[PDB]
Design a protein around this nucleic acid. Structure first.
Ligand SMILES: C[C@@H]1CCO[C@H]2Cn3cc(C(=O)NCc4ccc(F)cc4F)c(=O)c(O)c3C(=O)N12
Ligand SMILES: C[C@@H]1CCO[C@H]2Cn3cc(C(=O)NCc4ccc(F)cc4F)c(=O)c(O)c3C(=O)N12
Ligand SMILES: [Mg+2]
Ligand SMILES: [Mg+2]
Ligand SMILES: [Mg+2]
Ligand SMILES: [Mg+2]
Ligand SMILES: [N+]
Ligand SMILES: [N+]
Ligand SMILES: [Zn+2]
Ligand SMILES: [Zn+2]
Lengths: 184, 368, 368, 184
DNA sequence: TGCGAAATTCCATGACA
DNA sequence: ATTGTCATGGAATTTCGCA
DNA sequence: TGCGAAATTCCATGACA
DNA sequence: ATTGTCATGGAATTTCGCA
């Protein structure tokens, strides 16, 4: 069986609803399976149409052989099926209530939820502008399993933005009370 | 004056005036019988005025000016006095064309890595499409990989919006552009400083310098044109298709697509190359490093038979960028301060500001 | 189809498919093990479709199209099928650039006599001067003698007004112009027929053909510019001065002024040549006939290494004169009817009209 | 003494008043002394200013060494003197009431007065447009004294408009009554 | 029948949109 | 059915002045 | 160890205003 | 303080297939 490569499998998922930022509410999250490389896209809804619109941007740079997703309505619609078939992309769904990814992807998703949370405190509404820096952070984060960042694996070079500060990623006791304030 | 011309009349020899000819007075003027005819030798004190009158009839150069003078006069070393005036005629110097070519072009080394250097530039205005008129084109120096962004104006704000999206993927060491308003604004400089990106600017009015991206325009417009044949020019929806199409096109001299040079493996596009199917990613990346360094590099062409190359201290003139009708095509003479490379110089203009300038926008001031 | 590919599988030999290679079935497709890798041999009935899919990704030419196909397939003589498609892609044929130069320029004989041939052309719009915006420039072919008329528009009526004044002096056999509206109108044709003047037209969009007069523009504007330095561009009052100045200027290669070539003697202008003072007019005119025939004539330069010359029956394409944004730069292929000379041809367009056309506005249709 | 040449001497003179044609009333007449070549210029008046304006056109083609004229006010004004001095042209006047030209010039003037007269009958008001054809006729007229037309002597070639019909130039008995009508 | 320098000729370059 | 041209100003080559 | 033909490489040409 | 580039499609050259 052939070694795993970038573009073999894109894992896509929605995060949100979030506090509105520049009129956006959700993040479509795309993670390359082999590299751990992450792309993020703000959307106004977890619809097939917002999904197609975002993936059209991404697929003008790279087309995955397979897209893997849970059974979100956006992903199981017949429109989304047509879209994938047109591009020769095989669709693949995890069984309902049992999301399977890979360790790498699950841990990546984890980093994303945690990193977003850490940055949205104090500024729950300014996340739109932070999406670029989030991705750079995520893609220049050192992977313990391989010796390389997703950037290094995708492009085969060092990056000009190494995030040499491996971050706290935990919410300082201050911010824990700040977050427990926004829910009041 | 009349001093020199006196000794001449009484048959004594003065340096310059050959002895084998008969010099005489007639009609109150010193004359001489030269093979072509009888010419007046004016006094040295008169000569400059004569050359100037003759030159000024039509502001003619060496031979055409000489031929007028020679109709009535002879004196020793006439062309030397003609050339003196040509080098002092401000109108001739700033209006005439050069007849010396630039020295042969440099072929700067391909950037070593993807993201080492971006070349950026606008195309447009194009026919309105979804309210969009311009395309920001970003070309990665090493790979040729190109990104296309539709804009409404070639502005800083539109540039920043597009590059914020692109730099999501990676931040480049350098961004090279021409001197368009969008790229030279302090807002854009700030935007780059914030990200540790160095802004590099082309010498002004020399699109060769942005040649990596300029050349990509031609491929972009060409493919848009073919796709739009016999349809209305709805190009906005085609940018993504064109971007993808060009990034996955082979350059015959390199034998690779820009996508390949950036990722080392084709994505799921038609006719994907499969040669590294059995290699590990790591093996693949290692073969990619090797492919990247062994790419063809063009060499500096031979100089043309009559080129000039700049020298520190030389008088040279900058081309007027956008000359008005009936106005000179050249600025006043200025001095070469530093020769940055054989095709690029800093000049002191006469204002005097330091200006970094392409040799192609320069002529060597004629007649020293 | 599956016919040819069958004999191949059982180890028999078909022309084109070299025998020293192992051909087999796998995944329902005919394959082969070639040095570079394992490629699919599609049935002949499939090939055209494949070439077309590969070509159409970015409408690429020979090598770039081949390199896509070669990623997945092999069959005998692949480029031949690629080239077939390139020659049938209407979009490529009308959009791509030529990479063949025109054959070397003709240097037509100088007209034998003053007034044998006038070359005329407009300059402008210039900055308004006394309400005037254009200059009609008339150049006598043999002598270079030039007449300048200020106009308000580049119109027939203004052209007729000016030429009525000029032809007071002499009527020319021929008047050569480009295809500007002023010179192609039936009113202007009538005006010339009335006077026994033959109208000769340049091939369209080829100012080289009017080169005798075009070149004079540069001298005119150049002298206007110098005279106007640091003043407002009040050029109208200077036309007479410029006309006179240029007509009495020496051409260094000829060693004569156009005034001299027209009259055989200088008028009362500065630095008048006096060499024929002792000759009779008749002696003067006789020396002038001799000077006129012994003038320098340039020769056809060497062809560039990759030029084409037209051949009766050849498919060729006319350059679109003023192509809209994102629209093809070339018309559909047309056929060479007659080769008037090595740089000029009549073509049948596809409409089909006869059109007389410069080789410089033509490319030979690629891929036959 | 040196042989006679074109541009040695221009003989200038006014003809008119004439019937108004396109608002013009006079013709300034310029005849080259050596060649017999004629230039005509319509003016609104025999003033120095109309003279300078016309001669500026001519002198942008050829400058005469000498201008010869009678003692017309236009020609003897100090403005006209300045104009000539600026161009290095020597002015020369015939003595009052005794016009001296040369035979060639006098005969040329004669041809002009007669040719104009022949053409202005029936159309006394359309002479402006005829000035070009008048000059061509005049300059391609065979000279009995030399074997050549003024065109031939000026340019040293045959012309493309030979006036091979040596004209009547006399007024047919019809036109004599037509001219004796316009005076009524 | 030869030298150094001046004069003349050669011709690449660019520009007429 | 028509078609490049030629000022410019260093360099190359020739001619001049003198012996 | 050499032939005819195919494949590959060379590179002038023109175009990004 | 900076710097031309590269698709194209015939021609030239090299390599292949076979002996
Ligand atoms: C509206 C008519 C209809 C026909 O086409 C246009 C456009 N045109 C263009 C040029 C021009 O591009 N000159 C630059 C040039 C380029 C090369 C060369 F060898 C000589 C040169 F002078 C003219 O000179 C010109 O007269 C016209 C013109 O009259 N028209
Ligand atoms: C307003 C800014 C300020 C600076 O100048 C202008 C004008 N400009 C002109 C061209 C242009 O002439 N391209 C043709 C081209 C010519 C030769 C070559 F080798 C490559 C080539 F692409 C550009 O591409 C371009 O970007 C600009 C531009 O941005 N601006
Ligand atoms: Mg630009
Ligand atoms: Mg550009
Ligand atoms: Mg024209
Ligand atoms: Mg023109
Ligand atoms: N370099
Ligand atoms: N010819
Ligand atoms: Zn000058
Ligand atoms: Zn095509």
């Amino acid at each position: 069986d052939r070694p795993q490569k970038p573009f073999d499998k894109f894992f896509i998922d929605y995060i949100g609803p979030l506090p509105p930022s520049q009129g956006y509410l959700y993040v479509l999250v795309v993670v390359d399976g082999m590299t751990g490389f992450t792309w993020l896209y703000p959307t106004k809804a977890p619809s097939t149409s917002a999904t197609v619109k975002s993936l059209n941007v991404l697929t003008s740079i790279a087309i995955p052989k397979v897209i893997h997703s849970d059974q979100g309505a956006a992903f199981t619609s017949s429109t989304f099926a047509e879209w994938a078939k047109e591009r020769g992309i095989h669709l693949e769904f995890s069984t309902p209530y049992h999301p399977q990814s890979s360790g790498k992807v699950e841990r990546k998703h984890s980093d994303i939820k945690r990193l977003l949370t850490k940055l949205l405190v104090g500024r729950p509404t300014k996340w739109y502008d932070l999406l670029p820096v989030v991705q750079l952070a995520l893609n220049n984060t050192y992977s313990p399993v391989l010796k390389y960042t997703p950037h290094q694996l995708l492009f085969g070079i060092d990056s000009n933005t190494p995030f040499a500060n491996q971050d706290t990623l935990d919410l300082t006791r201050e911010e824990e009370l700040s977050l427990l304030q926004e829910i009041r | 004056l009349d001093a020199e011309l006196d000794q001449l009349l009484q048959g004594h020899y003065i340096k310059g005036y050959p002895k084998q000819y008969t010099y005489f007075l007639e009609d109150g003027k010193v004359k001489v019988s030269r093979p072509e005819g009888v010419k007046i030798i004016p006094p040295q004190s008169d000569r400059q005025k004569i050359v100037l009158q003759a030159h000024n009839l039509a502001h003619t150069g060496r031979e055409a000016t000489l031929l007028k003078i020679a109709n009535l006069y002879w004196w020793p070393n006439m062309r030397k006095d003609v050339v003196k005036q040509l080098g002092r005629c401000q109108q001739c110097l700033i209006t005439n064309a050069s007849n010396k070519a630039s020295g042969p072009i440099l072929r700067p080394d391909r950037p070593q890595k993807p993201f080492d250097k971006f070349f950026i530039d606008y195309i447009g205005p194009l026919p309105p499409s979804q309210g969009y008129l311009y395309v920001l084109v970003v070309v990665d120096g090493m790979t040729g990989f190109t990104w296309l962004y539709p804009t409404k104006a070639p502005s800083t704000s539109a540039t920043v919006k597009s590059l914020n999206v692109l730099t999501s993927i990676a931040i480049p060491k350098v961004i090279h552009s021409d001197q368009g308003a969008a790229f030279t604004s302090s807002t854009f400089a700030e935007w780059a400083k914030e990200r540790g990106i160095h802004l590099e600017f082309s010498t002004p009015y020399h699109p060769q310098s942005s040649g990596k991206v300029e050349r990509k325009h031609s491929d972009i417009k060409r493919l848009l044109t073919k796709l739009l044949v016999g349809r209305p020019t709805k190009w906005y929806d085609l940018l993504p298709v064109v971007q993808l199409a060009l990034n996955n096109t082979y350059s015959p001299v390199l034998k690779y697509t820009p996508h390949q040079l950036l990722f080392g493996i084709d994505s799921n596009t038609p006719f994907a190359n499969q040669d590294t199917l059995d290699l590990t990613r790591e093996e693949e990346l290692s073969l990619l490093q090797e492919i990247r360094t062994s790419l063809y590099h063009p060499s500096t062409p031979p100089a043309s038979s009559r080129s000039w190359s700049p020298v520190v201290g030389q008088l040279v003139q900058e081309r007027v960028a956008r000359p008005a009708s009936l106005r000179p095509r050249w600025h006043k003479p200025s001095t070469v301060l530093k020769v940055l490379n054989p095709r690029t110089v800093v000049i002191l203009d006469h204002l005097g500001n330091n200006r970094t300038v392409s040799i192609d926008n320069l002529k060597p001031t004629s007649h020293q």
